[PDB]
Amino acid sequence: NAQAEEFKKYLETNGIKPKQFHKKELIFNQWDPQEYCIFLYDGITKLTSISENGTIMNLQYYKGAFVIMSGFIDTETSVGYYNLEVISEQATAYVIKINELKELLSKNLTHFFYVFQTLQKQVSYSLAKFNDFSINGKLGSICGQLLILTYVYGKETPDGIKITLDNLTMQELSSAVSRIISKLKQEKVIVYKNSCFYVQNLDYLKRYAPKLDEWFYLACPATWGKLN
Amino acid sequence: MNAQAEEFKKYLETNGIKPKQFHKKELIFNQWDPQEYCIFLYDGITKLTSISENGTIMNLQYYKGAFVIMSGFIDTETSVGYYNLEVISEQATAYVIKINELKELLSKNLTHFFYVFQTLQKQVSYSLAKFNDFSINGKLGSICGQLLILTYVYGKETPDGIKITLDNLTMQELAVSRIISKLKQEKVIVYKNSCFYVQNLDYLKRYAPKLDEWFYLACPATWGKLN
Numbered sequence: 001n002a003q004a005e006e007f008k009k010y011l012e013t014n015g016i017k018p019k020q021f022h023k024k025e026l027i028f029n030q031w032d033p034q035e036y037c038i039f040l041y042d043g044i045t046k047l048t049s050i051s052e053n054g055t056i057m058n059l060q061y062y063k064g065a066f067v068i069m070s071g072f073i074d075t076e077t078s079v080g081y082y083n084l085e086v087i088s089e090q091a092t093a094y095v096i097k098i099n100e101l102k103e104l105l106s107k108n109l110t111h112f113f114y115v116f117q118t119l120q121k122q123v124s125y126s127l128a129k130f131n132d133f134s135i136n137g138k139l140g141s142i143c144g145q146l147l148i149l150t151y152v153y154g155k156e157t158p159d160g161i162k163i164t165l166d167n168l169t170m171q172e173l174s175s176a177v178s179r180i181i182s183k184l185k186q187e188k189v190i191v192y193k194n195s196c197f198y199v200q201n202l203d204y205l206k207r208y209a210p211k212l213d214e215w216f217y218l219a220c221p222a223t224w225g226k227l228n
Numbered sequence: 229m230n231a232q233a234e235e236f237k238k239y240l241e242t243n244g245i246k247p248k249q250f251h252k253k254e255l256i257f258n259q260w261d262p263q264e265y266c267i268f269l270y271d272g273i274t275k276l277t278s279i280s281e282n283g284t285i286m287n288l289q290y291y292k293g294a295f296v297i298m299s300g301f302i303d304t305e306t307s308v309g310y311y312n313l314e315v316i317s318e319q320a321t322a323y324v325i326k327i328n329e330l331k332e333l334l335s336k337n338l339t340h341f342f343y344v345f346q347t348l349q350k351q352v353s354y355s356l357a358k359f360n361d362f363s364i365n366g367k368l369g370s371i372c373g374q375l376l377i378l379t380y381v382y383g384k385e386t387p388d389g390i391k392i393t394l395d396n397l398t399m400q401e402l403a404v405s406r407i408i409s410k411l412k413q414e415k416v417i418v419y420k421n422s423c424f425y426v427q428n429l430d431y432l433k434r435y436a437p438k439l440d441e442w443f444y445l446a447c448p449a450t451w452g453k454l455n
């Protein structure tokens with residue numbers, strides 16, 4: 001992306017170096033009193049919360065380029081007790097104290113609008129998922145999640161739309177969930193060929209995840225028009 | 229209400245933006261509006277709805293003044309999503325502003341720019357907490373999460389319990405009567421005077437733990453008034 005590239009280089013101009021992370025590493029953890037603005041240039045991360053019996057809660061996933069912030073920008077107080085785990089093999093991320101963020105954006109409104117419209121997407125993204133889930137239950141949630149893997153990591157092939165994901169990432173991902181995927185298999189909306197995963201009926205996914213499909217058209221139109 | 233909100237209100241007025249009185253059931257904006265707005269809900273209560281192709285109305289989110297609700301992207305001024313913003317309180321004060329004008333106002337005042345930025349952070353992190361509590365305790369954490377918000381916001385320190393202040397207009401504004409019953413029975417909620425009370429705030433905290441954390445970090449003033 002161009003906007004993200006302009007932010008990458010704007011960060012480096014101001015002396016902020018990238019930092020390579022590896023799978024299962026933590027970019028920041030819930031006990032770090034320092035609040036950060038993570039610019040995940042490349043890689044895949046997940047935001048986890050730990051209940052007080054030890055159970056890890058996978059709450060959200062992020063793909064670079066994107067912005068994650070552990071503190072409110074105004075008061076510089078914590079958004080919550082969260083960790084940012086890297087689940088890809090290797091992820092690049094610019095780590096920035098929240099204090100320095102306000103200074104970088106105060107000088108330049110353009111990158112302020114970039115970070116600002118990024119949070120705008122995340123808000124509407126969640127509203128669109130919740131919408132589809134309230135209209136079609138888990139069916140909408142499954143089709144919506146499946147629509148992500150198609151619009152982003154998808155590519156057109158003879159056997160449909162293949163998911164360009166190292167199966168290391170795939171299995172990173174239940175009775176009712178099996179029922180849904182089962183029907184998708186029998187209707188061949190998806191497949192299991194060559195150990196891969198292809199999507200052949202994108203129109204089906206759009207039907208039961210319509211609001212999320214709208215979110216792409218409005219927030220990621222270049223990706224949306226690719227497979228449309 | 230919020231120190232930042234009051235100054236933002238003054239800031240909008242001094243730049244020639246007038247408040248507008250919306251009453252219950254009015255739409256500050258609907259989903260077929262080709263103009264994208266930045267709504268500053270100063271006072272009142274609203275909900276974000278969506279009409280499907282079937283014509284089915286879906287509630288998606290609730291907002292209470294002071295708060296910001298933008299329908300378009302700050303940069304491209306395009307819609308982030310086709311939503312309607314409906315008032316559900318008796319009356320509501322809101323400062324309707326074009327998005328192109330917002331871009332202008334926040335550019336000359338980074339302080340208010342950060343404030344609007346923070347209102348997005350509270351939505352995102354409010355959703356994550358709500359999603360965690362539902363992702364462990366299912367609908368129990370959701371209802372308890374919703375009740376927890378009502379308790380912290382509209383509660384009263386009455387020896388009877390915690391008096392939900394909401395005028396009846398938004399109380400019953402609201403498939404799972406087992407949940408309301410499992411709490412009606414358990415001395416967790418009681419409508420003594422025809423009005424809801426709370427006799428066990430720890431039940432709600434226990435099943436909405438992340439929402440409780442969020443409220444402790446986002447509204448620490450309101451959180452401690454019951455703790």
Ligand SMILES: O=C(O)[C@@H]1CSc2c(C3CC3)c(Cc3cnc4ccccc4c3)cc(=O)n21
Binds near residue numbers: 061129141145358
């Ligand atoms: O199941 C998942 O892993 C995905 C990834 S994150 C996510 C979300 C939102 C972004 C955090 C949602 C939306 C959602 C669904 N149901 C809810 C029920 C109660 C309260 C909030 C909810 C939010 C769905 C989803 O599947 N996933």
Ligand code: NA
Binds near residue numbers: 030032078081
């Ligand atoms: Na933290």
Ligand code: NA
Binds near residue numbers: 258264265299300
């Ligand atoms: Na709008």
